Amino acid sequence: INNMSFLITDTKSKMSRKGDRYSMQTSLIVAALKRL
Amino acid sequence: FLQINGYAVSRGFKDLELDTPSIEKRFAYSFLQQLIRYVDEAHQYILEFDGGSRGKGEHFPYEQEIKFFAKVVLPLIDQYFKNHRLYFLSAASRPLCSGGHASNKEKEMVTSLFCKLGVLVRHRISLFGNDATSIVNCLHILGQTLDARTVMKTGLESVKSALRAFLDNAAEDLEKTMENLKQGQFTKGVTQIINYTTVALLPMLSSLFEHIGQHQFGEDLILEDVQVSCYRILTSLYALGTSKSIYVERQRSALGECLAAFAGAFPVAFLETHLDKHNIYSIYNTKSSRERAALSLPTNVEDVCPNIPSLEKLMEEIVELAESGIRYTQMPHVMEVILPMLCSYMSRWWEHGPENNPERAEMCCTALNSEHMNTLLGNILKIIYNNLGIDEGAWMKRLAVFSQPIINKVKPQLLKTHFLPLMEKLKKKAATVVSEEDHLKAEARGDMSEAELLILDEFTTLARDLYAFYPLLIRF
Amino acid sequence: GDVVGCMVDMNEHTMMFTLNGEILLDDSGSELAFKDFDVGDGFIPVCS
């Protein structure tokens, strides 16, 4: 799970090492709380 | 002193010749020429080794050559095309406004290199050992980098024939795999083919079809004999997905994703055969009766895919799904291959649906509608609702990935009776979990001391259900 | 025809930009266009 496949996919629909490349901001729960 | 006396001193060695030709004097041209030549010598040495190892000369003098090939040429190709994908994929339409605009000959040689690597990988997943991953990765990247439209509209007939023959070989391998899986499932060529398909063919075809569908290359490349080969591929993939076999049990996921990519890429509405007469791209409209009889075709538009059901019938099957309360362990292939296929098919064919173009209606290829999508998504949601607390697996997470494009054309009235019960069962599960937490606060860890495997498993299942649903929730 | 809404928070020393009501983001997921800056003599709306 990288949350990127949901982070960078939603823009088209709305028409508007591992340690360093991995972040937690793509979490579904926190994304939902921001969007709701 | 020259300047103050005004003596003009110039560069003195101005360019005497234009030195213009870009089609020949480019680094990409030279590099791909060398790469294709090296792949050619690799192919000839691999056939020589095939003839020698089975003979007296098992020892191969070409150890240094094969080592250089595997350890240099393949990763170099992979990294180079990953870095410069946009340059080769650019056309008259500009993806990268800075520059680039790869030449037609360069695109031709990209396609030729992909075809040569496909020929090399065909039925040879063992001679390279661990290099099977390298060759399949290079083929994946190359297939993502192909420019099918430009290659077909301008290119050498040899390269076009190689591109057609790659798909023909893929269809033949799929047919061989199904035919030796049927009446052969009880019981080394069959094993070699069954391993080769899983290792290489399904990922390569998946990536190529996904790229073709994304870039709308199906209407330019999948024509006539290419359409016949794609019919064969579709039949083989669907029947492999539907078949009940211990061999296909653990490969049906790759079959499902490949079938979804093929449904997205294919330019003919195979599910809705009755409206195939309006599709100009149809071989059943272009090839005419005499060549369609000369070719291996059922001569009828409906009978092209006898096993694949019609869209309405498959909608009816999906509707009685999640209403009969059928579970993943029982009837798994349907929601493993059919549902991603339906999602991809609808995502492709909504633009061609009459709702996009209400004018000149009933001349459009399909009969798809936003009502079809909302019904499909509701049936999916009922499936996941019924399989929420029991029979959990990565299918919930993968189906959620597949169902994302459908959400764009869903009315908000679904949430009035679908989107609340799912969070209802989530709060019930989470409240139960925090209830046993409020009971046994003291022990909450991963090992096995006092009944904490139950709480760990319930936490994992609720987390996986939350990633089943929350992508749908946020994009709704 | 796009409308850019510019927000400044001089209490927390932050700046934000929205395009048609949607908050713009940097390379990361941060909503802050400029995370930190001294108050100085203040700020005024400006365009070029």
Q: How many CA atoms lie within 13 A of B301 on its CB side?
A: 19
Assigned token pair, B463: 């987390």
Q: Give the minimum alpha-carbon distance from A3 to chain B in angstroms, rounded to a whole number.
A: 9
For B19, left (φ over 0), alpha (ψ -120 to 50), or beta?
left
> Within 10 Å of residue B163's Cβ, how many Cβ atoms?
23
Do residues B462 and B429 make contact, with C-beta atoms less than 8 angstroms apart? Answer: yes
Which residue type is seen at B428?
K
Within 10 angstroms of residue B175's Cβ, the number of other Cβ atoms is 15
Three-class secondary structure of residue B377 per DSSP: helix
Q: Which residues pair with C5 in a beta bridge?
A: C18
φ, ψ of residue A13 in degrees (nearest 5): -70, -35
Residue B319 sits at φ, ψ, to 5 deg, of -70, -40
Nearest residue in C to A4, CA atom? C29
**Residue written as token pair 């869209």:** B311
Q: Residue C22: list chain A partners with CB under 8 A.
A: 14, 16
What's the Cα-to-Cα distance from B265 to each of B213, B303, B322, C14, rounded to whole Å? 4, 21, 29, 46
- Closest residue by Cα to residue B354 from B275, B408, B407: B275
Mention every residue, 6+ apart, whose C-beta is less than 8 A from residue C22: A14, A16
Q: Which residue has the tokens 């940097």?
A: C26
What is the four-CA torsion angle of B91, B92, B93, B94, rounded to 10 degrees?
Answer: 70
B252 residue type, one letter: R
Other beta carbons within 10 angstroms of residue B295's beta carbon come to 13
Task: Give the residue among B368, B159, B344 at the shortest CA–CA distance from B266.
Answer: B344
Q: How far is B237 from chain A (nearest CA, A)?
A: 26
Nearest to A16 among C22, C28, C29 (CB): C22
Chain A positions touching B407 (Cβ under 8 A) are: 13
Q: C-alpha angle with apex B331: B405 to B393, nearest 5 degrees?
A: 60
Burial bucket for residue B454 (CB in 10 Å: 0-12, 13-18, 19+): exposed
- Other CB atoms within 10 Å distance of the CB of residue B440: 13
* Tokens linked to B162: 């190689």
d(CA B174, CA B170): 6
Is residue B360 within 8 Å of residue B429, measured between CB atoms?
no
End-to-end CA distance of chain B: 77
* Cβ contact B470–A32 (<8 Å): yes
Place of tokens 């909503």: C31
Out of C20, C28, C29, the one facing A16 most closely (by C-beta) is: C20
> What DSSP element (H or E) covers C6?
strand C4-9
Q: Tell me the sheet residues that pair with B21.
A: none
> Helix B225-242 and helix B157-181: axis angle, to 10°?
20
Inform me whether the C-beta atom of residue B423 falls under 8 Å from chain A C-beta atoms.
no
User: What number of residues does chain B have?
Assistant: 476
| Cα B399 from chain centroid (whole Å) | 15
CB-based contact, B475 to chain A, within 8 Å: yes
| Sign of the C-alpha dihedral computed for residues B111, B117, B120 and B125 taken in this order | negative
Residue B187 tokens read as: 């019981």
Spatial contact of B263 and B295, defined as CB atoms under 8 Å apart: no
End-to-end Cα distance, chain A: 22
For testing contact with chain A, the best of B396, B401, B419, B467 (most A CBs within 10 A)? B467
B476 at interface of A, judged by CB pairs closer than 8 A: no
Q: Entry resolution in angstroms?
A: 2.9
DSSP code for A27: -
Asked if the C-beta of B455 comes within 8 angstroms of chain A's C-beta atoms, the answer is no
Q: Which backbone phi and psi does C19 adopt, to 5 degrees?
A: -110, 110
Cα C24 from chain centroid (whole Å): 9
> What is the C-alpha to C-alpha distance for residues B197 and B195, in angstroms, rounded to an integer?
6
Residue labelled with tokens 């399949």: B136
Q: How does DSSP classify residue B129? A: T
Q: How far is C27 from chain A (nearest CA, A)?
A: 12
Does B408 touch chain A if contact means CB atoms closer than 8 Å?
Answer: yes
* A25 Rama class: left (phi>0) / alpha (psi -120 to 50) / beta: alpha
Q: What are phi and psi of C8, to 5 degrees?
A: -125, 135
Would residue C16 be called left, alpha or beta, if left means φ above 0 and alpha means ψ between -120 and 50 degrees?
beta
Distances (CA, A) of A11 to B19, B410, B440: 45, 17, 44
Among B195, B114, B192, B205, CA closest to B151? B114
